[PDB]
Amino acid sequence: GTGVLTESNKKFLPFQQFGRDIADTTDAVRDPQTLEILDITPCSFGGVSV
Amino acid sequence: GYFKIYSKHTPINLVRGLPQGFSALEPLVDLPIGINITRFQTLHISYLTP
Numbered sequence: 001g002t003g004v005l006t007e008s009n010k011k012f013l014p015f016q017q018f019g020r021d022i023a024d025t026t027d028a029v030r031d032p033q034t035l036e037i038l039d040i041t042p043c044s045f046g047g048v049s050v
Numbered sequence: 051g052y053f054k055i056y057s058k059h060t061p062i063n064l065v066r067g068l069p070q071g072f073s074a075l076e077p078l079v080d081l082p083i084g085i086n087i088t089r090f091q092t093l094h095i096s097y098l099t100p
């Protein structure tokens with residue numbers, strides 16, 4: 001993927017590895033080495049009008 | 051081929067009968083035993099008394 005990894009306070013259960021959003025997109029991921037929860041946010045995008 | 055166990059432990063004050071309510075069973079362990087199972091039996095403890 002591609003995004004910004006921000007440390008998050010998601011209440012991940014010990015047996016849960018990632019948290020798909022309602023849109024079934026992997027919103028948060030458990031870091032495999034350090035068992036911590038990192039929220040994933042898509043890098044900033046938008047329209048550009050002139 | 052995976053033997054999955056889900057478990058839940060709740061304090062119930064009811065004296066007899068299966069309680070009425072909701073409680074989700076968090077996974078306990080999954081084992082790749084890979085065997086065929088068609089029957090099962092429960093094991094109980096015995097209290098030896100004089």
Ligand SMILES: *[C@@H]1O[C@H](CO)[C@@H](O)[C@H](O)[C@H]1NC(C)=O
Pocket residue numbers: 032033034035
């Ligand atoms: C190795 O990974 C395990 C499990 O994620 C973790 O507990 C441990 O701290 C890691 N150690 C190193 C060397 O990264």
